Amino acid sequence: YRHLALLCDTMTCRGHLMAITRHGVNRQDTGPLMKCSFEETVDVLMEA
DNA sequence: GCGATGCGGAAGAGAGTCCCCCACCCCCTTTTATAGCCCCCCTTC
């Protein structure tokens, strides 16, 4: 359960349903370098 | 009467898995020697 509970917590820790796509994982306030390694490498870095 | 605006729906992006003018050079022409090559007309039968 702890593995399942951890995934659900990360998807709801910010008070809204956060998808595990780029639209939810890159929107969270992480560093641009982490975001660029996931998806949208240049668009993420251009915005930063 | 006289304007002014937010939301749903549709659309659309965006990401993942040629013709002319201006130098410069060559050939036009003439002379001559050389000789193989080849076109053209003539001649043969």
Nucleotide nearest to A44 (CA to C1'): B15
Strand B nucleotides within a 7 Å radius of protein CB atoms: 14-17
Contact A2, A11 (CB under 8 A): no
Contact A10, A18 (CB under 8 A): yes
Contact A32, A45 (CB under 8 A): yes
Please give the Cα distance from A10 to A5 (Å, whole number): 9
Round and report the angstrom distance from CA (A48) to C1' (B28): 77
Angle at A1 between CA A13 and CA A37, to 5 degrees: 50
Torsion of CA A3, A37, A48, A43, to 10 degrees: -110
Please give the Cα distance from A48 to A31 (Å, whole number): 9
